[PDB]
Amino acid sequence: FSNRQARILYNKAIAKALFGLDIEYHPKGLVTTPISRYIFLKTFLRGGEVALEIGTGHTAMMALMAEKFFNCKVTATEVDEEFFEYARRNIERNNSNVRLVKSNGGIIKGVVEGTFDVIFSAPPYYGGKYGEEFSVKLLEEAFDHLNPGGKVALYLPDKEKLLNVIKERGIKLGYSVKDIKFKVGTWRHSLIFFKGI
C-alpha cells in the first residue's frame, strides 16, 4: 500500500528531523509515530533510569529514544523474529547500546531477569473482554522486577472501559496510578503505575 508508504516516509522524516534517528520500517509493521511516543516518554522518564521496554517492535523507536534523550540503560524485548531482525538493524544503524532480547512468547518472566526503575510498553490492546489481558499480566509480572519507587508506564488508546479495567487491576496489585491524556494526534493516554516505598 502506497498510503502507508507516504505515512512511513513522513514518519521516518520526523524521526530524523526531530530525534536524529535513521529508522527502517518493516513493510507489515505498525507505522510507529515517533512524536507521540516521545511525548509518552516525557510523561514519566526523568533521566538515568535502568529501563525495560516490552515489545519494542520493528522500529525499536522508544528504546532508542529512552537511551539517546533520557540517558537510560535500556533492555528491550521483541517476540516476532522478523520484527526482532529490524529492531537489531535499527539499534545498529543508530550506534545504540540498547540490549535487544528475543521473547519466545512471554512478557517478562521467562524472557528477562533483573530489576528496573522503569518498565514500559505500548501494548497491542485489541485479549480479555476489553483487550486488557496483556496489560494486566505485564503489571502482575513487573512487580518483582521493579526497584523501590520503580514504575510501569503503558501507552494506550482512548478507550474508556479498557483504561478503567487496567487502572482498577493495577491498583488491586498495589500500585498507585497517574493517567495523563494527550492528542498528538489523529487521543492517547499514558497510564503510569507507581510501586513506591
UniProtKB/TrEMBL annotation:
Q: Name the Gene3D superfamilies on file.
A: Vaccinia Virus protein VP39 (3.40.50.150)
Record keywords, A-Z: Methyltransferase, Transferase
Which superkingdom is the protein from?
Answer: Archaea
Could you confirm whether the keyword Transmembrane appears in this record?
Answer: no
Transferase as a keyword of this entry, yes or no, is: yes
Q: Where is the Methyltransferase domain?
A: 52-122
GO molecular function: any one? 23S rRNA (adenine(1618)-N(6))-methyltransferase activity
Q: What is this protein called?
A: Methyltransferase domain-containing protein
Q: Which organism is it from?
A: Pyrococcus furiosus (strain ATCC 43587 / DSM 3638 / JCM 8422 / Vc1)
